[PDB]
Swiss-Prot record, chain A:
Effect of R22Q: In MODY10; reduces binding affinity to INSR; reduces biological activity; reduces folding properties
Name of protein: Insulin B chain
Superkingdom of origin organism: Eukaryota
Gene assigned in the entry: INS
Organism expressing this protein natively: Homo sapiens
UniProtKB/Swiss-Prot annotation, chain B:
Range within the parent protein: 90 to 110 of 110
Domain of life: Eukaryota
Entry protein name: Insulin A chain
Paired cysteines (S-S): C6-C11
Annotated transmembrane regions: none
Length: 30, 21
């Protein structure tokens, strides 16, 4: 597992494993 | 934006873990 690209979908998944139960903000710059 | 530093750039278990509160 090395640094890579990931947005929302696969992005929170990563946020999930890293923390997951800690909950993240995952803001969307629209 | 955070989904850009990862989707528009690179993000590791630390960059996305730095987003989980």
């Amino acid at each position: 597992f090395v640094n890579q690209h990931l947005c929302g979908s696969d992005l929170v998944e990563a946020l999930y494993l890293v923390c997951g139960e800690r909950g993240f903000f995952y803001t969307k710059p629209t | 934006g955070i989904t850009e530093q990862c989707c528009t750039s690179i993000c590791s278990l630390y960059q996305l873990e730095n987003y989980c509160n």
